[PDB]
């Protein structure tokens, strides 16, 4: 489900911001990556009856290539011990998220 997937991402983002230990932020990012990759294969209401090959659906899955890439970025920083950097990196997903709500809701 798409709306669940975003609940995951929004919740776990908060977990990173509020985190006390590096294990928290890495486990959060890992959860966010799956939800993101999960959402990419969904189709939202505004494109209910659009072809999977259409521009709109190409755009949908393309945007998630950014969101996953930005997550992957934060995950790599965390896995490399740049854990403060991984946290700042994750703040960027708010911009990505705003572009989603703006376009599909």
């Amino acid at each position: 489900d798409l709306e669940d997937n975003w609940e995951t991402l929004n919740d776990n983002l908060k977990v990173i911001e509020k985190a006390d230990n590096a294990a928290q932020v890495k486990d959060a990012l890992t959860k966010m990556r799956a939800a993101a990759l999960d959402a990419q294969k969904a189709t939202p209401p505004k494109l209910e009856d659009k072809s999977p090959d259409s521009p709109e659906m190409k755009d949908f899955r393309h945007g998630f290539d950014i969101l996953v890439g930005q997550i992957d970025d934060a995950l790599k920083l965390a896995n490399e011990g740049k854990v403060k950097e991984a946290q700042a990196a994750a703040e960027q997903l708010k911009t990505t998220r705003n572009a989603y709500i703006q376009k599909y809701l």
Epitope: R61, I66, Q70, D72, A89, A99
Partner: antibody, heavy 122, light 107 residues
Framework: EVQLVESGGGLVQPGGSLRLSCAAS????????MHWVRQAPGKGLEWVAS????????YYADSVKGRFTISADTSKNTAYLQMNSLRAEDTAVYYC???????????????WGQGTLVTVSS | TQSPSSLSASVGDRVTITCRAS??????VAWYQQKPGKAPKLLIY???SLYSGVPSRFSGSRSGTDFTLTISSLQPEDFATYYC????????????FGQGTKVEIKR
């Protein structure tokens, strides 16, 4: 002080190949996002590709997708733009740029190379 | 593909350049300055933040689906071309630059 010094531009014929260099000094190119931005004679800035070396995440404009290939060599501390199947419309001054933090590209590109001219012509 | 727009103004003039976004422009936009032969310089980052060493007569604001670069009093060395970095939209290319605006001396 962050410095980006480019090289590799020059002449090439349609369909040829050419590899641009963006040599970085003042920071470790591993932890950054490097971007190529080009500008055809008399026209505007067009973003082309970017790479986050440490993570390998890579992005491309549609106009060069499948033909260009951005990369980085951290030991040499430089990023590259491999340009294959070139055409006349690829004639431009090519810049490399980098944001403040590896993840702040959407806020602006702070540092720029000086640019190198690429002329595609037979 | 596109050539810069042009605009004539005198020293001391107030000029405001507008870039148009396909949605609520929100924060992650930038403004660059470029003079001939030279790379662009970052002027305004994050919609309204003044980059270092940029005079305070430059300012950047944002309203609805538009965002703006304002030069409160054009100085001779502000005649240049100005570029905006469009806000990302879902599915778009990672970075997109606006058309470009060349400010020239009225006489």
């Amino acid at each position: 002080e962050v410095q980006l010094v480019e090289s590799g531009g020059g002449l090439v014929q349609p369909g040829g190949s050419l590899r641009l260099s963006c040599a970085a000094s003042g920071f470790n190119i591993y932890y950054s996002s490097m971007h190529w931005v080009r500008q055809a004679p008399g026209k505007g800035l067009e973003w082309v590709a970017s790479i986050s070396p440490y993570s390998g995440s890579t992005y491309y404009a549609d106009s060069v997708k499948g033909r260009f290939t951005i990369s980085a060599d951290t030991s040499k501390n430089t990023a590259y733009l491999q340009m294959n199947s070139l055409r006349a419309e690829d004639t431009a001054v090519y810049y490399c740029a980098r944001p403040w933090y590896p993840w702040s590209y959407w806020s602006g590109l702070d540092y720029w190379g000086q640019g190198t001219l690429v002329t595609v012509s037979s | 593909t596109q050539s810069p727009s042009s605009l004539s103004a005198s020293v001391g003039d107030r000029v405001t350049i507008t870039c148009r976004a396909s949605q609520s422009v929100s924060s992650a936009v930038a403004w660059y300055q470029q003079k001939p032969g030279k790379a662009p310089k970052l002027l305004i980052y994050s919609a309204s933040s003044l980059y270092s060493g940029v005079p305070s007569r430059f300012s950047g604001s944002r309203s609805g689906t538009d965002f703006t670069l304002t030069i409160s009093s054009l100085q001779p060395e502000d005649f240049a071309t100005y570029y905006c970095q469009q806000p990302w939209s879902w599915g778009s290319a990672l970075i997109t630059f606006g058309q470009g605006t060349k400010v020239e001396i009225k006489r």
